[PDB]
Design an enzyme around this catalytic site. Sequence first.
Site, PDB file in Angstrom:
ATOM      1  N   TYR A   1      87.811  84.998  35.066  1.00  0.00           N
ATOM      2  CA  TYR A   1      87.357  83.807  34.347  1.00  0.00           C
ATOM      3  C   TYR A   1      86.832  84.010  32.955  1.00  0.00           C
ATOM      4  CZ  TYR A   1      87.588  81.589  38.995  1.00  0.00           C
ATOM      5  OH  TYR A   1      87.977  81.042  40.163  1.00  0.00           O
TER       6      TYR A   1
ATOM      7  N   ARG B   1      91.661  75.440  44.135  1.00  0.00           N
ATOM      8  CA  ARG B   1      92.905  75.482  44.950  1.00  0.00           C
ATOM      9  C   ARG B   1      92.638  75.809  46.425  1.00  0.00           C
ATOM     10  NH1 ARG B   1      93.587  80.550  46.522  1.00  0.00           N
ATOM     11  NH2 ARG B   1      92.466  82.164  45.299  1.00  0.00           N
TER      12      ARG B   1
ATOM     13  N   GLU C   1      76.005  84.041  37.346  1.00  0.00           N
ATOM     14  CA  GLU C   1      77.466  84.109  37.222  1.00  0.00           C
ATOM     15  C   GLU C   1      78.018  83.257  36.078  1.00  0.00           C
ATOM     16  OE1 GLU C   1      80.372  82.092  39.818  1.00  0.00           O
ATOM     17  OE2 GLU C   1      81.206  83.975  40.328  1.00  0.00           O
TER      18      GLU C   1
ATOM     19  N   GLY D   1      89.054  76.195  49.117  1.00  0.00           N
ATOM     20  CA  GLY D   1      87.589  76.128  49.276  1.00  0.00           C
ATOM     21  C   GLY D   1      87.172  76.474  50.694  1.00  0.00           C
ATOM     22  N   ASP D   2      86.321  77.477  50.834  1.00  0.00           N
ATOM     23  CA  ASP D   2      85.685  77.811  52.058  1.00  0.00           C
ATOM     24  C   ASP D   2      84.480  76.900  52.104  1.00  0.00           C
ATOM     25  OD1 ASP D   2      83.748  79.041  53.700  1.00  0.00           O
ATOM     26  OD2 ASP D   2      84.190  81.068  53.046  1.00  0.00           O
TER      27      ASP D   2
ATOM     28  N   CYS E   1      90.090  80.909  42.095  1.00  0.00           N
ATOM     29  CA  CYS E   1      90.048  79.734  42.955  1.00  0.00           C
ATOM     30  C   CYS E   1      89.858  78.471  42.105  1.00  0.00           C
ATOM     31  CB  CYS E   1      88.979  79.784  44.037  1.00  0.00           C
ATOM     32  SG  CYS E   1      89.297  80.859  45.572  1.00  0.00           S
TER      33      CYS E   1
ATOM     34  N   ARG F   1      92.204  62.903  26.155  1.00  0.00           N
ATOM     35  CA  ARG F   1      92.589  62.942  27.605  1.00  0.00           C
ATOM     36  C   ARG F   1      93.146  64.332  27.992  1.00  0.00           C
ATOM     37  NH1 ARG F   1      95.013  56.951  27.369  1.00  0.00           N
ATOM     38  NH2 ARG F   1      96.467  58.082  26.042  1.00  0.00           N
ATOM     39  N   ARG F   2      92.942  65.297  27.119  1.00  0.00           N
ATOM     40  CA  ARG F   2      93.405  66.708  27.282  1.00  0.00           C
ATOM     41  C   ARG F   2      92.245  67.712  27.244  1.00  0.00           C
ATOM     42  NH1 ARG F   2      96.693  65.156  22.303  1.00  0.00           N
ATOM     43  NH2 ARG F   2      98.393  63.904  23.214  1.00  0.00           N
TER      44      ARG F   2
ATOM     45  N   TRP G   1      80.610  89.813  42.919  1.00  0.00           N
ATOM     46  CA  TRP G   1      81.876  90.404  42.484  1.00  0.00           C
ATOM     47  C   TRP G   1      82.010  91.928  42.632  1.00  0.00           C
ATOM     48  CZ3 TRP G   1      86.152  87.766  40.326  1.00  0.00           C
ATOM     49  CH2 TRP G   1      85.950  86.422  40.039  1.00  0.00           C
TER      50      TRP G   1
ATOM     51  N   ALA H   1      75.454  86.536  73.024  1.00  0.00           N
ATOM     52  CA  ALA H   1      75.774  87.718  73.853  1.00  0.00           C
ATOM     53  C   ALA H   1      77.214  87.551  74.324  1.00  0.00           C
ATOM     54  CB  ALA H   1      74.842  87.804  75.047  1.00  0.00           C
TER      55      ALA H   1
ATOM     56  N   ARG I   1      95.110  84.499  55.092  1.00  0.00           N
ATOM     57  CA  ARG I   1      95.085  85.852  54.554  1.00  0.00           C
ATOM     58  C   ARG I   1      94.081  86.827  55.177  1.00  0.00           C
ATOM     59  NH1 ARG I   1      91.894  88.038  51.346  1.00  0.00           N
ATOM     60  NH2 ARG I   1      90.874  86.024  50.775  1.00  0.00           N
TER      61      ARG I   1
ATOM     62  N   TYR J   1      86.345  78.252  58.090  1.00  0.00           N
ATOM     63  CA  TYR J   1      86.721  79.443  58.884  1.00  0.00           C
ATOM     64  C   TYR J   1      86.281  79.316  60.324  1.00  0.00           C
ATOM     65  CZ  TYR J   1      88.473  82.052  54.857  1.00  0.00           C
ATOM     66  OH  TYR J   1      89.202  82.546  53.784  1.00  0.00           O
TER      67      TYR J   1
HETATM   68  O1  LIG Z   1     104.413  61.757  32.937  1.00  0.00           O
HETATM   69  C1  LIG Z   1     103.650  61.107  32.196  1.00  0.00           C
HETATM   70  C2  LIG Z   1     103.518  61.335  30.795  1.00  0.00           C
HETATM   71  C3  LIG Z   1     102.596  60.519  30.108  1.00  0.00           C
HETATM   72  N1  LIG Z   1     101.819  59.574  30.753  1.00  0.00           N
HETATM   73  C4  LIG Z   1     100.924  58.714  30.007  1.00  0.00           C
HETATM   74  C5  LIG Z   1      99.467  59.036  30.196  1.00  0.00           C
HETATM   75  C6  LIG Z   1      98.908  58.572  28.858  1.00  0.00           C
HETATM   76  O2  LIG Z   1      98.817  57.140  28.872  1.00  0.00           O
HETATM   77  C7  LIG Z   1      99.997  59.007  27.886  1.00  0.00           C
HETATM   78  C8  LIG Z   1      99.845  60.385  27.366  1.00  0.00           C
HETATM   79  O3  LIG Z   1      98.843  60.377  26.323  1.00  0.00           O
HETATM   80  P1  LIG Z   1      97.641  61.422  26.342  1.00  0.00           P
HETATM   81  O4  LIG Z   1      96.967  61.552  27.675  1.00  0.00           O
HETATM   82  O5  LIG Z   1      98.268  62.737  25.971  1.00  0.00           O
HETATM   83  O6  LIG Z   1      96.723  60.960  25.213  1.00  0.00           O
HETATM   84  O7  LIG Z   1     101.234  58.946  28.612  1.00  0.00           O
HETATM   85  C9  LIG Z   1     101.975  59.404  32.109  1.00  0.00           C
HETATM   86  O8  LIG Z   1     101.388  58.586  32.769  1.00  0.00           O
HETATM   87  N2  LIG Z   1     102.860  60.198  32.817  1.00  0.00           N
HETATM   88  O1  LIG Z   2      84.564  80.414  44.289  1.00  0.00           O
HETATM   89  C1  LIG Z   2      85.146  80.674  45.381  1.00  0.00           C
HETATM   90  C2  LIG Z   2      85.928  81.828  45.609  1.00  0.00           C
HETATM   91  C3  LIG Z   2      86.551  81.917  46.882  1.00  0.00           C
HETATM   92  N1  LIG Z   2      86.445  80.919  47.823  1.00  0.00           N
HETATM   93  C4  LIG Z   2      87.000  81.092  49.166  1.00  0.00           C
HETATM   94  C5  LIG Z   2      88.294  80.275  49.429  1.00  0.00           C
HETATM   95  C6  LIG Z   2      88.979  81.194  50.450  1.00  0.00           C
HETATM   96  O2  LIG Z   2      88.344  81.056  51.696  1.00  0.00           O
HETATM   97  C7  LIG Z   2      88.642  82.578  49.893  1.00  0.00           C
HETATM   98  C8  LIG Z   2      89.696  82.941  48.891  1.00  0.00           C
HETATM   99  O3  LIG Z   2      90.885  83.368  49.485  1.00  0.00           O
HETATM  100  P1  LIG Z   2      92.344  82.900  49.018  1.00  0.00           P
HETATM  101  O4  LIG Z   2      92.278  81.431  48.883  1.00  0.00           O
HETATM  102  O5  LIG Z   2      92.593  83.587  47.723  1.00  0.00           O
HETATM  103  O6  LIG Z   2      93.263  83.381  50.152  1.00  0.00           O
HETATM  104  O7  LIG Z   2      87.368  82.479  49.293  1.00  0.00           O
HETATM  105  C9  LIG Z   2      85.696  79.790  47.562  1.00  0.00           C
HETATM  106  O8  LIG Z   2      85.484  78.899  48.345  1.00  0.00           O
HETATM  107  N2  LIG Z   2      85.036  79.703  46.354  1.00  0.00           N
END
Ligand SMILES: O=c1ccn([C@H]2C[C@H](O)[C@@H](COP(=O)(O)O)O2)c(=O)[nH]1
Ligand SMILES: O=c1ccn([C@H]2C[C@H](O)[C@@H](COP(=O)(O)O)O2)c(=O)[nH]1
Lengths: 287, 288
Positions: free
Chosen positions: B110, B190, B62, B192-193, B170, B150-151, B84, B287, B25, B233
């Site tokens: 965020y 998603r 932050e 990381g620079d 990110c 686990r959630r 920011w 240079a 980008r 980069y």
């Molecule tokens: O696609 C799936 C759906 C469920 N589980 C398993 C993970 C856990 O053992 C359980 C879900 O229970 P919780 O993580 O929600 O407690 O089902 C998977 O492995 N894959």
């Molecule tokens: O907390 C942050 C915010 C941004 N980036 C970096 C990742 C990318 O280099 C750029 C974000 O650009 P996109 O991934 O959105 O294109 O900034 C990080 O590493 N950490």
Amino acid sequence: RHGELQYLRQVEHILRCGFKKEDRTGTGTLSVFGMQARYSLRDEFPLLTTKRVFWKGVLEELLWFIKGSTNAKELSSKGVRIWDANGSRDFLDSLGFSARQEGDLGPVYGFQWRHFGAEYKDMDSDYSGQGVDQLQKVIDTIKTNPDDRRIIMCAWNPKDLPLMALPPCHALCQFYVVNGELSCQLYQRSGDMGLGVPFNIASYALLTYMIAHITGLQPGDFVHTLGDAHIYLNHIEPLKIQLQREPRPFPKLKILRKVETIDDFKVEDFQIEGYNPHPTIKMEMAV
Amino acid sequence: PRHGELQYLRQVEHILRCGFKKEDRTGTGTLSVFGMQARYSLRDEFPLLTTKRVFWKGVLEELLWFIKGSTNAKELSSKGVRIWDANGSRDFLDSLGFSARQEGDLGPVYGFQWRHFGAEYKDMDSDYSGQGVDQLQKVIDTIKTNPDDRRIIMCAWNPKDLPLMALPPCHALCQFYVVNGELSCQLYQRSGDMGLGVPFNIASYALLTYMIAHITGLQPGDFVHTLGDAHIYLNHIEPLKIQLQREPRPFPKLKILRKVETIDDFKVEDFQIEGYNPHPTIKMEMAV
Ligand SMILES: O=c1ccn([C@H]2C[C@H](O)[C@@H](COP(=O)(O)O)O2)c(=O)[nH]1
Ligand SMILES: O=c1ccn([C@H]2C[C@H](O)[C@@H](COP(=O)(O)O)O2)c(=O)[nH]1
């Protein structure tokens, strides 16, 4: 090295390094937090061989997600019962959803993937074009801006969670393109290593194949990331026997015609070729 | 034992050695690997890199700014943290089609997602009291009441709000986990620079983990850092190679200087970094 070795290595790691952890189900687990494996999708498809995976379930479930269905019955009618207990009269009533028809799971995957942020009514409602179509967005982005670092489909929807029959395990996935190859990373918050994870690897590997086909790319890698990776206490002995098995080379997945949109895929468009999973062997436990 | 900083340094090396050239980008270009994961112990140490100075003041101000729900770049700018500011500028906002927005208004970034997920965003000055999902307190309440859950997730990726954000998040989500009396956190980042971002991001989520561990009566466990597009980069290769020659020294410690009962009650002065004396940030002249 064979990709399935990574799975087996994770299973081994949990058996050796994992901590005992109580869980929601009351079954008990051995658990590790944080794991990652990478499965090549290149000229092979990672359908595990040390124990047969329910491929029928994998493929019909994914087609059900894609069509945006939140009706367990629409899956059950294909002979895949995985969502049935969660859509049952008694289960729905237990959550306070006595107003729902049987089968109405609420705003689970299909709904989030195709209508994120729309107001959920019931499973029969017309959501035509409401909310965010993440699946179509991902596909469009891969075609127009394949370098994009935001190509994400998220099923974790905190506002909607209390309406779901159960919370999503597959919180989000991200796609990536380089070198004409399409890769996908799954963030799976919770993985039943013995019974869920192999089906899960196949689901997102397939999705990758489907999207690669639509977008004219070659499948690259599927990266599988776990939160609580666990082995249920009841699966410890079966997985010990499994760990001793040598994986067979993975099968190939064939797409049987040129398909142009993600909505047009159907079950008969796919063939798993050369799938040779180990046969089961009877194992006894006694006290 | 092997120092935790070596996890970061090994990732940088792996990208440099095995990454693919990938356009991006910004137009700069990158070396890129998709899918990486590092684990940083938080036990009796705090992962602030020693081989290059990380902007700790920025990390702490932050985070406190996220916790209070702020989406106003000016609130953070007044702390001397300008990170920011460009994204809340008149010119940037206008570029995004937000010509009516007040300078500083980042949209539902965020702070807003963490405290008010799902609320209808109006502007940075609006009262969102009791609107949307306060995922941050819900994480904290779950850790207290059902640590095996686990959630335990806090998610800033909100597809519906994305077009209103000054930039897309990110740090898409994080998940917490409890075992053996220790709280661990995994971040799914998603993008990381590695040169500029990642050191700061490791510190932010390790700090968040310490704060929540403190409120919940737990010991910090592991921070697991998961990356989508992990990239260097092309203008950061030579500086990183210098940095790679630097031997890691012991990570510093983080102390919390009082007993804090709720997450909203943390203040800057509650924190002290001990034994941090990093190499300086890297500047190279050519240079051409
Ligand atoms: O696609 C799936 C759906 C469920 N589980 C398993 C993970 C856990 O053992 C359980 C879900 O229970 P919780 O993580 O929600 O407690 O089902 C998977 O492995 N894959
Ligand atoms: O907390 C942050 C915010 C941004 N980036 C970096 C990742 C990318 O280099 C750029 C974000 O650009 P996109 O991934 O959105 O294109 O900034 C990080 O590493 N950490």
